[PDB]
Every structure is written in structure tokens, then in C-alpha cells.
Design a protein around this ligand. Structure first.
Ligand SMILES: [Cl-]
Ligand SMILES: [Cl-]
Length: 162
């Protein structure tokens, strides 16, 4: 089990443009295309990303390539982030996977705002941070995914995923 298999489980794989849980235009493995309501805009963003006239449909290889770029962007944001870097550095390999997940899903700014939970994570107060991570819009909108991620922060194992 690794970050790639993990996110692949949480995001699934779709070869045609689709709408996410928030109603946004997405494609592949959670690759958000635009917050815009226009399918045209979405189509245009996808063609830009792939480098071709896609017609709103991509192939497996293509989805995987976006996915690779996105995981890499995610890690890089955490390391560049003044609030994130430190938490990340202090954690073990599994728990690091869970922070990358959360970022991939909510953006760095987004995760960087969870001030209190970050602090508890850093202090290694597992049960405490889990509860705190639970009091969020994130947990209320996507309860099952959040449950999995939070369980990973709490335990330090892949149990929620096996
Ligand atoms: Cl892109
Ligand atoms: Cl969910």
C-alpha cells in the first residue's frame, strides 16, 4: 500500500469528464478541471492539460500521467508550505501518506488552515487530532473518505484501506 494505491481507492478512475462531490468538472483520478459551470470551459481546460483536442474523453495512460503530476505537485506544496513542512517532517511514512491525501483533496491552503489539528499531529497526540479533524465541513460532506484518512492519522497503519 502506498500513496498512489491509496488515492486511487479514494478517487476512482473515470475516462470522461464528470462532476465531483461539490459539482465541479473533473476527469481521471480526481483531477479537477475548473470551478466554472461551463462544460466548454472544462473541455478547454482538459485539452490544455493533455495537449490535444480531446473531445472530453481521455485514455488510461493519460489519466495516469495527470495523476503522477498531481501527486508530485501535492508533495511539493507541502514541502514549500511554511505551515505544512514541519508537520510532514515530524511524521512517520504512513501518516505522511495521509497528509498528502488531504492536501491532494483540499489544497494546501485548505489543509494549512487546520491550525489546531496540525499542532496536535506534530505533538503526536493521535486520538486528540482525530477528533479535531472530525469537526469540519470536510468530515461532514465526505464522511467515509474522511473516516479513512483520519483513521490513518490516528493509527499509523493501512487498516482502513485493507
Ligand atoms: Cl495540468
Ligand atoms: Cl465519502
Amino acid at each position: 500500500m502506498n500513496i498512489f494505491e491509496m488515492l486511487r481507492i479514494d478517487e476512482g478512475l473515470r475516462l470522461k469528464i464528470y462532476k465531483d462531490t461539490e459539482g465541479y468538472y473533473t476527469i481521471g483520478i480526481g483531477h479537477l478541471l475548473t470551478k466554472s459551470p461551463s462544460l466548454n470551459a472544462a473541455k478547454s481546460e482538459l485539452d490544455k492539460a493533455i495537449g490535444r483536442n480531446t473531445n472530453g474523453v481521455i485514455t488510461k495512460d493519460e489519466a495516469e500521467k495527470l495523476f503522477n503530476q498531481d501527486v508530485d505537485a501535492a508533495v511539493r506544496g507541502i514541502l514549500r508550505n511554511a505551515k505544512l513542512k514541519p508537520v510532514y517532517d515530524s511524521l512517520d511514512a504512513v501518516r505522511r501518506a495521509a497528509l498528502i491525501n488531504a492536501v491532494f483533496q483540499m489544497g494546501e491552503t485548505g489543509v494549512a488552515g487546520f491550525t489546531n489539528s496540525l499542532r496536535m499531529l506534530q505533538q503526536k497526540r493521535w486520538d486528540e487530532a482525530a477528533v479535531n479533524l472530525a469537526k469540519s465541513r470536510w468530515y461532514n460532506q465526505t464522511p467515509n473518505r474522511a473516516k479513512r484518512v483520519i483513521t490513518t492519522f490516528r493509527t499509523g497503519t493501512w487498516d482502513a484501506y485493507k
